[PDB]
Design a protein that fits this description.
With 345 residues, this protein is mostly beta strands. It has a single domain, classed as 7 Propeller (Methylamine Dehydrogenase, Chain H), CATH 2.130.10. The chain is built from no helices and 28 strands. It is found in: Dynein axonemal particle. Key assembly factor specifically required for the stability of axonemal dynein heavy chains in cytoplasm.
Length: 345
Amino acid sequence: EKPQIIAHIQKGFNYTVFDCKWVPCSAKFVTMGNRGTGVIQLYEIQHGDLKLLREIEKAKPIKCGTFGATSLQQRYLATGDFGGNLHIWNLEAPEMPVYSVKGHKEIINAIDGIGGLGIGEGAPEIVTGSRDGTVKVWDPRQKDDPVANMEPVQGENKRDCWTVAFGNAYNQEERVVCAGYDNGDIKLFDLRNMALRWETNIKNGVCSLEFDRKDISMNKLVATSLEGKFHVFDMRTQHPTKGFASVSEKAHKSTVWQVRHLPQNRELFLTAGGAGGLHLWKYEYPIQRKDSEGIEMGVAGSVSLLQNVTLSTQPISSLDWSPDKRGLCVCSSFDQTVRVLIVTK
């Protein structure tokens, strides 16, 4: 018996929206995008309806945001905009940012936060991934300079970073950043001692990366790509030269824009595709997760499609499951609609 993906509530917006996130411990969410100027908009679910509470114009279009580094008492939105600025915002008083750095030379494409909201050990950090080809890690207590910078050696060419994801944050010294690029590069950096723990290439642009849960020893990692392709890597077993076992799926014919694991269940995940398609997958682990030479390597499992609907005219470019209420989900589209979905069962 199949879960149902129900369009519960929706609202038209009149600009471009590039990202959306639930405001933690609330019935609220933000959207962000772009006159050519930037905007964040704050919504709340009210009498089963959607009330626009606020809108915040900024100088430059906003590409992505995250609450993942903020506290309950602050709930500040960290954003990456089109001129390479990273801002932290008090939504209640957003005229001036709490934190401001021109971190990057081009659009910040992607952003993640860990350590805030009691998720992840260690001080709170934000990771930004840019069109300038660099990935930087920021501690909001240190103005101006990042605490880590992952970029090619000076003689090597820059690519375009499309996606960044925190993982492995189970204690104060353990923490990785997985980054994805326009040429299909996936690079996994260990932040404890700056190490390039693993690198691969998936042929096409890595549109989105997400670990199955952020604050546990790396379990699964999903990468999504052009041509309806996504990959699920078992992260528990690395062969030093062969890497991590994986299974690919062709979900749609179109670009797979985003993967989001259910916060309440790490084996469940949604993909959002190029044509407004949402597919809901569950991973199945093989009986046992050594090679010819007696060196360990992972064993890839399978994914089974649970449900799929087409809910938009345009790409569904961003998605966020509710941390507060299981199966509640928000997504944004290039048709200029935000949708509140309920996922049953």
